[PDB]
């Protein structure tokens, strides 16, 4: 059920999303900008292992379209994106190191929800 605080909490989520996409974090956010193109990258098992792909452009579309009804729904998708990275790749992969840094940006600012 919708709460009067949901619009304002979703604005905080939108601010986080804008930050994740910003130049400040681009050195480690870039693998998460667009859907994984598994065929182009030679990752021919990606869709056998990752049943629910997610990326920041999809989060952005869902925000713009008012798909997310509350902050928890938004956070679940961002976390799904990171989890997919932790599931698919070995833990010493550079993309995992980038995911951990971007997730730290996300989690610390999400925790500051007004
Ligand atoms: C999210 N993303 C974007 N590019 C990649 C990945 C990944 O998980 N593994 C991986 O190997 N590559 C190249």
> CA torsion 9→102→56→33, rounded to 10°?
150
**CA–CA gap between residue 92 and residue 95 (Å, rounded):** 8
**CA–CA gap between residue 13 and residue 75 (Å, rounded):** 8
Q: Which tokens belong to 89?
A: 């790749």
- Domain spans in the chain, listed from the N-terminal domain onward: 5-111
Distance 36 CA to ligand 1 centre (A): 6
Which residues line ligand 1 at a C-beta cut-off of 6 Å? 31-32, 36, 41, 85, 88-89, 95
Contacts of 54 (CB under 8 A, 6+ apart): 77, 78, 80, 81, 84
Resolution (A): 1.1
Stretch (H or E) spanning 7: helix 6-20
CATH architecture of 5-111: Up-down Bundle (1.20)
**Phi, psi for 29 (deg, rounded to 5):** -90, -20
Distance 58 CA to ligand 1 centre (A): 16
């Amino acid at each position: 059920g919708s709460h009067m605080q949901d619009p304002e909490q979703l604005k905080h989520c939108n601010g986080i999303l804008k930050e994740l996409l910003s130049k400040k974090h681009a050195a480690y956010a870039w693998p998460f900008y667009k859907p994984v193109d598994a065929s182009a990258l030679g990752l021919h098992d990606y869709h056998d292992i990752i049943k629910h792909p997610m990326d920041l452009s999809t989060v952005k579309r869902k925000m713009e379209n008012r798909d997310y009804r509350d902050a928890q729904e938004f956070a679940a998708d961002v976390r799904l994106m990171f989890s997919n990275c932790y599931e698919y790749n070995p833990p010493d992969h550079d993309v995992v190191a980038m995911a951990r840094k971007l997730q730290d940006v996300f989690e610390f600012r999400y925790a500051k929800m007004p």
